[PDB]
Amino acid sequence: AAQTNAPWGLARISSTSPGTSTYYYDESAGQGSCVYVIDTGIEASHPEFEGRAQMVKTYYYSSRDGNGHGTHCAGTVGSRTYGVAKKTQLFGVKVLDDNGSGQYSTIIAGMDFVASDKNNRNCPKGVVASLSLGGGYSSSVNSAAARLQSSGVMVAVAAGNNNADARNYSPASEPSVCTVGASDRYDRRSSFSNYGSVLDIFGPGTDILSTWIGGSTRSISGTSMATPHVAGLAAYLMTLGKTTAASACRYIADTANKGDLSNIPFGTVNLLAYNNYQ
Structure with a gap:
């Protein structure tokens, strides 16, 4: 399948080169997979989600996304226009308040929730969780992410936006999950x-157009935007039968575009997520 005039990041993930604008993907499109977006919520009524999104848990007075961040990330995973895996099922877990903040105890509870809740959902092709959030190093937060991964969920987490070594942030620094850095449309590391060394992969993260609350769209930047590209890619590849939740981060790294990014510090992987769709 081909989507013309796609957001640059979608085109990038199906291309061996920067500077194109068509996204190419197998029409299976993540059908039969599920992605949990653990964030500020998802505006499930957005037309872009087509009835494929739903809120399953909140830790606050409402399940509504009153921020937008979670809705944007969910859109990059699975919206019809802005998403990688256009037929996946999206499940929202609201661990962050409408200012984008959340206590680590709530975030941990949300990860353990997903590890169990997947047993209440129909995801025959596999389960992914996208965590566009983080703070300072916490062994308990890292352990929660490790448990979620161990339970059979492909966990993708943002590296963080500090222009610093991700070893000092969580869940970014957990070795067993897939830690995602951000790139721009010219194949530069995002500023x-x-x-x-804890990064596993880069995805598009600068100037990423996706869904927003109020039925709208906008372009924003962050490793929060790179992470759902990788989560949606994992769901897509699992639906194709090419990999599994336990192996998908390694598979994505194995099949990535290699050596194409600039300003990658010595010792960080130079690997850009790629669907290898022909």
């Missing part, structure tokens, strides 16, 4: 992206 804010964290780096370091």
Whole structure:
């Protein structure tokens, strides 16, 4: 399948080169997979989600996304126009308040929730969780992310936006999950992206158009935007049968575009997520 005039990041993930604008993907499109977006919520009524999104848990007075961040990330995973995996099922877990903040205890509870809740959902092709959030190093937060991964969920987490080594942030620094840095449309490391040996992969993160609350759209930047590209890619590849939740981060790194990014510090992987769709 081909989507013309796609957001640059979608085109990038199906291309061996920067500077194109058509996204190419197998029409299976993540059908039969599920992605949990653990964030500020999802505006499930947005037309872009087509009835494929739903809120399943909140820790606050409402499940509504009163911020937009979670809705944008969900859109990059799975919206019809802005998403990588255009037929996946999206499940929202609201661990962040409408200012984008949340306590680590709530975030941990949300990860353990997903590890169990997937047993209440129909995801025959596999389960992914996208975590566009983080703070300072916490062994308990890292352990929660490790448990979620161990339970059979492909966990993708943002590297963070400090232009620093991600070893000092969580869940970015957990070795067993997939830690995602950000790039721009000219194949440069995004100026804010964290780096370091704990990164597994880069995805598009500068100037990413996706869904927003109030039925709208906007372009924003962050490793929060790179992470759902990788989460949606994992769901897409799992639906194709090419990999599994336990192996998808390694598979994405194995099949990535290699050596194409600039301003990658010595010791950080130079790997850009790629669907290898022909």
